[PDB]
Amino acid sequence: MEIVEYPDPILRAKNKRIDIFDENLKNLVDAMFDVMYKTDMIGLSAPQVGLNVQLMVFNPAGEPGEGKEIVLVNPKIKKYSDKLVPFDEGCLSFPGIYAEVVRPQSVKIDARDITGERFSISLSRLPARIFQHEYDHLEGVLFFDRMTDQVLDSIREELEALEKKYEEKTGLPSPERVEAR
Ligand SMILES: [Zn+2]
Ligand SMILES: [Zn+2]
Ligand SMILES: [Zn+2]
Ligand SMILES: [Zn+2]
Ligand SMILES: [Zn+2]
């Protein structure tokens, strides 16, 4: 199981809705939770482990044997709160890189569960923050897209280092460039 890193094009590719709720989905969900616990995360979207499908696994407590294991298939955020708050965000696709992002404080979410049944939930505080970040992955959106220009200045070099690393690894030109901003 492989964690994808920026600027890998998997992180910007279109993510397909899931229509069949079967054992392939069960097995992928188990593997995604296990990556999530191994990496000390509260949520994990599928493109981050290399699969372009609309799937997130989530434990608001982020601790084994605690909280709830939530699977969100084809999720939609139906409502964002008007109140916006700053927080220093990280991302598994950008190892060691953190910076301030402002997002709504709370959200309301519609999705389908592992058996295909509709449910909805509301999140606030750290869970709403992590949720929005991983949901953005599902739409091919990355956390520096949400950053102000001043915050982006502070990590531009760390990002260019990632772009040069992709070029070294593949021999292909970096598919996107932060200097375009
Ligand atoms: Zn397992
Ligand atoms: Zn597990
Ligand atoms: Zn922890
Ligand atoms: Zn991320
Ligand atoms: Zn430069």
Side-chain angles (χ1 to χ4, degrees), residues 1 3-13 15 17-75 77 79-107 109-124 126-155 157-168 170-181:
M1 194 93 165
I3 290 132
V4 171
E5 294 184 16
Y6 171 85
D8 194 318
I10 282 164
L11 301 169
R12 302 297 194 165
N15 297 304
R17 287 210 302 181
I18 287 156
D19 303 315
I20 302 177
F21 295 69
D22 60 356
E23 294 298 318
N24 287 339
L25 174 64
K26 277 200 186 332
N27 295 155
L28 179 54
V29 166
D30 169 78
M32 286 178 62
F33 273 118
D34 296 344
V35 174
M36 192 197 83
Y37 289 116
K38 186 187 183 70
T39 63
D40 197 23
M41 288 169 87
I42 272 148
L44 186 65
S45 65
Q48 275 226 299
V49 294
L51 300 160
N52 290 112
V53 295
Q54 294 182 32
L55 174 63
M56 195 193 304
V57 300
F58 199 86
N59 186 342
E63 292 296 332
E66 234 71 61
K68 285 205 133 31
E69 287 189 347
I70 307 166
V71 358
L72 299 117
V73 184
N74 315 332
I77 296 179
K79 177 88 180 319
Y80 291 92
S81 69
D82 288 325
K83 202 213 180 182
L84 306 184
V85 302
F87 175 83
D88 273 19
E89 263 177 51
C91 177
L92 265 192
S93 302
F94 298 80
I97 300 162
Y98 313 82
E100 171 168 288
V101 177
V102 341
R103 297 187 185 270
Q105 178 182 66
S106 66
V107 292
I109 301 145
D110 285 0
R112 295 219 265 164
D113 69 21
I114 214 172
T115 68
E117 298 295 309
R118 292 197 172 190
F119 71 96
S120 95
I121 78 286
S122 298
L123 294 174
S124 48
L126 185 59
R129 169 60 56 135
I130 301 311
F131 183 88
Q132 287 171 85
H133 175 101
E134 295 295 326
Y135 181 79
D136 273 357
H137 275 300
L138 293 186
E139 275 165 3
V141 174
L142 298 186
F143 76 150
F144 70 89
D145 300 353
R146 299 272 185 207
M147 290 175 186
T148 62
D149 285 10
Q150 292 89 188
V151 167
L152 189 58
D153 282 351
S154 82
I155 60 173
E157 290 319 313
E158 264 171 307
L159 260 66
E160 285 184 292
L162 286 173
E163 297 168 10
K164 150 161 186 255
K165 205 160 172 302
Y166 181 94
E167 290 175 359
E168 297 173 311
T170 70
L172 294 168
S174 169
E176 57 182 304
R177 262 154 174 137
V178 66
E179 294 270 77
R181 282 278 294 271

